[PDB]
Amino acid sequence: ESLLYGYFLDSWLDGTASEELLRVAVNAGDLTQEEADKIMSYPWGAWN
Amino acid sequence: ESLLYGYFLDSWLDGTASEELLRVAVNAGDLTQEEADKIMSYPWGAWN
Amino acid sequence: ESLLYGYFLDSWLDGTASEELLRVAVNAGDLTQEEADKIMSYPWGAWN
Amino acid sequence: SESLLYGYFLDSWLDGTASEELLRVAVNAGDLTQEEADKIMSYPWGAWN
Amino acid sequence: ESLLYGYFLDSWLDGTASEELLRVAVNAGDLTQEEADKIMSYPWGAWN
Amino acid sequence: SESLLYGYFLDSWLDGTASEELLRVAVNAGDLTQEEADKIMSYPWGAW
Numbered sequence: 001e002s003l004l005y006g007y008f009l010d011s012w013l014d015g016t017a018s019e020e021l022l023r024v025a026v027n028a029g030d031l032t033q034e035e036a037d038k039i040m041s042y043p044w045g046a047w048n
Numbered sequence: 049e050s051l052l053y054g055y056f057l058d059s060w061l062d063g064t065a066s067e068e069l070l071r072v073a074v075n076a077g078d079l080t081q082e083e084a085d086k087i088m089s090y091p092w093g094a095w096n
Numbered sequence: 097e098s099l100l101y102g103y104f105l106d107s108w109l110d111g112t113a114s115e116e117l118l119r120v121a122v123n124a125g126d127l128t129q130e131e132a133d134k135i136m137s138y139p140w141g142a143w144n
Numbered sequence: 145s146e147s148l149l150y151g152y153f154l155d156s157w158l159d160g161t162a163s164e165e166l167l168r169v170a171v172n173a174g175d176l177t178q179e180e181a182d183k184i185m186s187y188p189w190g191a192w193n
Numbered sequence: 194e195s196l197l198y199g200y201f202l203d204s205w206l207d208g209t210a211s212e213e214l215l216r217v218a219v220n221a222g223d224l225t226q227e228e229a230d231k232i233m234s235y236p237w238g239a240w241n
Numbered sequence: 242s243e244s245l246l247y248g249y250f251l252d253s254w255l256d257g258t259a260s261e262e263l264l265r266v267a268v269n270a271g272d273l274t275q276e277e278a279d280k281i282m283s284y285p286w287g288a289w
Contacts, residue, residue, distance in 0.1 A: 146245055150245075151245065151246055151249055154246075154272070155249075183270045183271065183272070184270075186266060186269065186270050187263075187266050187267075187270065188263070188266070191258075191263060192253070192258050
């Protein structure tokens with residue numbers, strides 16, 4: 001599991017990360033594509 | 049124990065997570081069903 | 097220490113956790129009884 | 145090996161929310177060693193308040 | 194991976210870290226040049 | 242390996258809270274090595 005998985009998931013659940021931002025993280029190798037797809041399976045902005 | 053166990057327990061105690069959200073995390077494989085059931089034995093929104 | 101020992105000690109020190117909450121954590125296996133007893137030895141709400 | 149809560153208690157000492165009273169309880173509980181509490185007390189109490 | 198990679202990436206996303214800061218961290222051995230380049234690929238200040 | 246509190250003290254230097262006097266105390270306490278204090282003081286005090 002990527003070290004920043006939880007960090008990016010939390011940003012998705014709080015609505016601060018967009019799909020574009022997750023693509024940047026995948027491109028950088030900070031998330032795998034599979035992890036970004038998992039994160040996007042959650043409701044965007046669920047915490048709000 | 050799942051890495052995000054404490055993250056999701058804290059979100060249940062702070063009243064931001066719902067049962068529906070914990071089920072999304074179990075589907076994602078970020079929590080096991082047993083862990084979601086442990087979290088739901090605590091008082092939701094206990095932190096206020 | 098259990099993974100969440102510091103998390104629950106901090107909640108006791110900040111006055112957010114109650115004895116009941118610690119015992120729910122013991123019942124869930126997130127603290128040992130000995131850990132809950134050690135946490136309750138500290139001043140509740142010391143952080144103010 | 146460092147007690148896991150060493151940084152936690154040092155931060156409380158620097159923020160002025162802990163005094164020796166709390167460090168005494170932590171040492172008695174086995175959450176800090178006496179040597180660790182003496183190291184923390186070497187810092188300026190409340191410097192980061 | 195450098196231990197402070199996430200710390201510096203978060204500071205960049207927050208808009209608190211500057212390129213100069215990342216370069217200081219590289220010179221200090223706290224980041225690799227490749228890591229500073231990865232961080233700079235993200236949008237500066239996307240977190241508020 | 243970095244001292245456990247390296248990031249903690251570097252962050253306090255960047256946020257303008259720590260002084261050289263504080264770093265001297267941390268080296269004397271064995272919380273930072275002298276090399277680490279020298280690295281930290283290389284960064285811009287109060288940058289954040």
